[PDB]
Amino acid sequence: KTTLFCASDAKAYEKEVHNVWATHACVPTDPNPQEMVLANVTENFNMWKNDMVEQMHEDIISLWDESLKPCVKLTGGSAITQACPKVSFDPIPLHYCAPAGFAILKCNNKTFNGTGPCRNVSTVQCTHGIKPVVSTQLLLNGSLAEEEIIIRSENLTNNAKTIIVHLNESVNIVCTRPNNIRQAHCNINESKWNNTLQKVGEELAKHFPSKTIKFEPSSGGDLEITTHSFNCRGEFFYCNTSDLFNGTYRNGTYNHTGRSSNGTITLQCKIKQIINMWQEVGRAIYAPPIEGEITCNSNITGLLLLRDDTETFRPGGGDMRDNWRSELYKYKVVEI
Ligand SMILES: NC(=[NH2+])NC[C@H]1Cc2ccccc2[C@@H]1NC(=O)C(=O)Nc1ccc(Cl)c(F)c1
Ligand SMILES: *[C@@H]1O[C@H](CO)[C@@H](O)[C@H](O)[C@H]1NC(C)=O
Ligand SMILES: *[C@@H]1O[C@H](CO)[C@@H](O)[C@H](O)[C@H]1NC(C)=O
Ligand SMILES: *[C@@H]1O[C@H](CO)[C@@H](O)[C@H](O)[C@H]1NC(C)=O
Ligand SMILES: *[C@@H]1O[C@H](CO)[C@@H](O)[C@H](O)[C@H]1NC(C)=O
Ligand SMILES: *[C@@H]1O[C@H](CO)[C@@H](O)[C@H](O)[C@H]1NC(C)=O
Ligand SMILES: *[C@@H]1O[C@H](CO)[C@@H](O)[C@H](O)[C@H]1NC(C)=O
Ligand SMILES: *[C@@H]1O[C@H](CO)[C@@H](O)[C@H](O)[C@H]1NC(C)=O
């Protein structure tokens, strides 16, 4: 183990909260980072048991703690209140670096699925730039798989283990609350989504011999996980995906059965004030949404799934440590 530090291009003149936090909590990234390629070496990685994930998790928690102040914060029977000003919120890439005396192993096997042996290895001082994007169901503004779609699980046969799909082509998603002040919506091109679930259906079909692979909405639970929740400019969006995860893959073909219109799937969204915290068990209450057009144009770079004659997969999430995993799976902290 170690104590990693972070590096970023945070502007000290920037009011945006990620910048304000990184400037005081992080170090300036290196303008030209080099890696140290290695042959005749193979190392084992376990994305599911990586301490780097917990360290980033802890930073993002303190980053949010300092950045997003909820009016009220309830933990059972006790409540804390404070000023909760609206802020400039837009994630920036964070780099994680090993201190003097340690390094960071980097798997270069472009098909490596997070766990097991990795032949093509390398050594770096810092990870690549990772946007600490908090969301469920859909992974946003992340990196793409270089060659084909990659299915990641701590155990695939264990239907309780979250599955991380690493897309090799991003699907664009635009969410907007137009200038009901809490009513918003997202647009997704159905063509891109059809192709996405077609491929994803194939990669899954593999792993699961010959079964009718269905995609359905989250069976139930808190809104944070039964919908695609995320933060857009500080506002907490909860977007319905019952028309997104709605289809079936059989006989090597995908059929989207979710509603769509002129080739665009739209998610009905709801900007909420009361939010079940991901940082800890509790509820945070924020002020009503700011005025004007609130829009976030993002890229879907991965999916979070949970499997139930037909296998059924549903959108998952909730443990933000999986969001960090989807980018940190390549890395491993090692000693010198
Ligand atoms: N209920 C809570 N108190 N905390 C528990 C977390 C941890 C966990 C693990 C699995 C499934 C769900 C959860 C709980 N997660 C959240 O409530 C959650 O993820 N909330 C959240 C909150 C805001 C945004 Cl933008 C978002 F994407 C998510
Ligand atoms: C990923 O690859 C490893 C070998 O490195 C294998 O043991 C494991 O079953 C694979 N995981 C999945 C879910 O396909
Ligand atoms: C993306 O990955 C999927 C994996 O199933 C593959 O089918 C598709 O051809 C890939 N696209 C590329 C490599 O351009
Ligand atoms: C994964 O889960 C299945 C079913 O729960 C179990 O039989 C299997 O032992 C698990 N695999 C590992 C390597 O733990
Ligand atoms: C999503 O929208 C559908 C269609 O109205 C609805 O049936 C379902 O209850 C919604 N899901 C959630 C989590 O509210
Ligand atoms: C698929 O979408 C349709 C149209 O919105 C909806 O009526 C149906 O309930 C969905 N199927 C599910 C939720 O599995
Ligand atoms: C995918 O969606 C597009 C856009 O509406 C549509 O033209 C096409 O028929 C769909 N194909 C599949 C496989 O669902
Ligand atoms: C994703 O990145 C884009 C480009 O910077 C940004 O406009 C968008 O708001 C981001 N989405 C989220 C959810 O942070």
Scored b (16 or more CB within 10 A) or e, 51-74 reads ebbebbbebbeebbeebbbbeebb
239/232 Cα distance (integer angstroms): 12
C-alpha angle 140-214-217 in degrees, rounded to nearest 5 = 55
- Ligand 6 center to 322 CA (angstroms): 27
Give the Å distance between the CA of 307 and the centre of ligand 4.
14
Instruction: For residue 72, give the amino acid letter.
Output: V
Quoted resolution (Å): 2.5
Method: X-ray
Query: Checking phi first, is residue 212 left (phi over 0); if not, alpha (psi -120 to 50) or beta?
Result: beta
Distance in angstroms (rounded) separating the CA atoms of residues 296 and 324: 21
* Parent domain of 176: 1-336
Whole-angstrom Cα distance, residue 164 to residue 112?
A: 13
Say how many Å lie between the CA of residue 141 and the centre of ligand 8: 6
Ligand nearest to the CA of 312: 6
DSSP SS3 for 331? strand
CATH number of the domain that residue 246 is part of: 2.170.40.20
Instruction: Give the dihedral sign, CA 218/221/222/223.
Output: positive
Q: Which atom of ligand 8 is nearest to the CA of 131?
A: 14
- For residue 47, the 8-state DSSP code is G
- For ligand 3, atom 10, the nearest C-alpha belongs to 148
Domain count, the chain: 1
Report whether 204 contacts 215 (CB < 8 A): no
E strands within 58-109? Answer: 72-75, 78-81, 95-97, 102-107
Three-state SS for 25? helix
In 148-263, the DSSP E strands lie at: 150-153, 163-177, 183-189, 212-215, 228-232, 235-239, 247-250, 253-256
Closest to 289 (Cα-Cα) out of 165, 183, 147, 160: 183
CA-nearest residue, atom 2 of ligand 8: 298
In this structure, are residues 259 and 245 in contact, taking their beta carbons and an 8 Å threshold? no
* Cα R_g (the chain), whole angstroms: 20
